[PDB]
Every structure is written in structure tokens, then in C-alpha cells.
């Protein structure tokens, strides 16, 4: 991978979870389910983050 990236050649991975495919084949259903589950996990993480707040941030600064 170093022989690769010596000319940068930034690694590429799938970023197609924002297009949000219109009604189609099984790809659209699979995409809808993965977006829903990522969104649920995201909401859980944020509610957790403000269960305590920025106290950990204060400790990091100290």
C-alpha cells in the first residue's frame, strides 16, 4: 500500500449511503434498512453524549 500511496492515491471505500435510492430492487430496501439502523445508533449515541454533557471535556482540558 505504500508503493501505492507514494503518489497519494487515496484509498476508496463506498460512500453511497446518502444518495437514498428511489423505489427499486433489493438494493433500495437494503439501503433503507442500513440508513435506518445507522440513524437509530446515531440518535442513541447523541442522547448518551448529553446524558453527561461536557464534563469529560473539562477533564480533558485540565
Amino acid at each position: 500500500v505504500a508503493a501505492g500511496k507514494g503518489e497519494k492515491l487515496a484509498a476508496i471505500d463506498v460512500q453511497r449511503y446518502i444518495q437514498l435510492k428511489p423505489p427499486g430492487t433489493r438494493e433500495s430496501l437494503l439501503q433503507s434498512a442500513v440508513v435506518w439502523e445507522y440513524q437509530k445508533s446515531r440518535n442513541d449515541n447523541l442522547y448518551l453524549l448529553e446524558k453527561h454533557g461536557e464534563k469529560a471535556f473539562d477533564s480533558s482540558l485540565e
Partner: protein, 131 residues
């Protein structure tokens, strides 16, 4: 060596003095931190209830061939897919169990109504025979 929670081979099985069951120490301690109660007997449970135990470890697969591995995204997708499908089957099971419960309720209710029907029909028939 059959986990009762998931079925995967437990890498650190432990034994319980009151009711020995196949778990691992870490999630037991995590649950006790969340809820310090015995799930089965509905009684107070402590951290000292479990004795240390030794284990012989396991082998690992080590995915080879080293091709700029992007698989992690697809494998994560598949794990989330499995849990989403499992949520789907859970919703189906709740819908069908409630439908079944209501069906049982008015099955038995109609059973009683037709019990009254039969009782009145037999009463009338025997009175006609009595006459």
C-alpha cells in the same frame, strides 16, 4: 460449551454457585452494574458470587491475501442487516401472538355462547319428549 445467550462458544465460561449457567464474566458484571439483581431468581446478586476459572483459549482465522481491505464496511452492513431482520421477525411475532390471543378469546366466547345454544336446544327437545 453452548452459550444460552447466543450459542457462540464462550471463551471464558464461568460457573454459578446457586444456579450454574453458561455465561462470560464481563457481561455478567456489566449487567450487575446496570442492575445488581439475579435475572433468574429475582434476588440480590453481587460481584463476589463468581469464583475465578481458567480457560485454554481458541484459534483465530486471520483473513489473508491483503487486498487494500474494504470488507469491513460490507461485513458491518451484514451484521446490521442481520439485527434489522431480527427486529423484523420480532415485530412479526408480536403481531401474530396478539392476533392469536384475540382469536382465542372470542373462540372461547363463541364456545360459551353456543354452549348456551346447545343447552336451550336440549332443554326444549327433552321437554317436547316429556310432553
Amino acid at each position: 460449551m453452548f452459550c444460552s445467550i447466543s450459542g457462540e462458544t464462550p471463551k471464558e465460561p464461568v460457573i454459578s454457585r446457586v444456579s450454574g449457567n453458561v455465561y462470560e464474566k464481563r457481561l455478567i458484571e456489566q449487567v450487575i452494574r446496570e442492575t445488581s439483581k439475579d435475572p433468574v431468581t429475582q434476588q440480590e446478586c453481587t460481584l463476589e458470587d463468581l469464583v475465578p476459572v481458567k480457560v485454554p483459549d481458541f484459534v483465530r482465522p486471520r483473513p489473508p491475501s491483503a487486498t487494500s481491505l474494504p470488507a469491513l464496511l460490507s461485513l458491518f452492513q451484514e451484521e446490521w442487516d442481520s439485527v434489522a431482520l431480527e427486529q423484523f421477525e420480532l415485530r412479526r411475532n408480536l403481531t401474530e401472538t396478539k392476533q392469536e390471543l384475540s382469536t382465542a378469546l372470542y373462540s372461547l366466547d363463541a364456545a360459551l355462547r353456543v354452549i348456551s345454544r346447545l343447552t336451550k336446544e336440549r332443554d326444549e327437545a327433552r321437554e317436547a319428549l316429556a310432553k
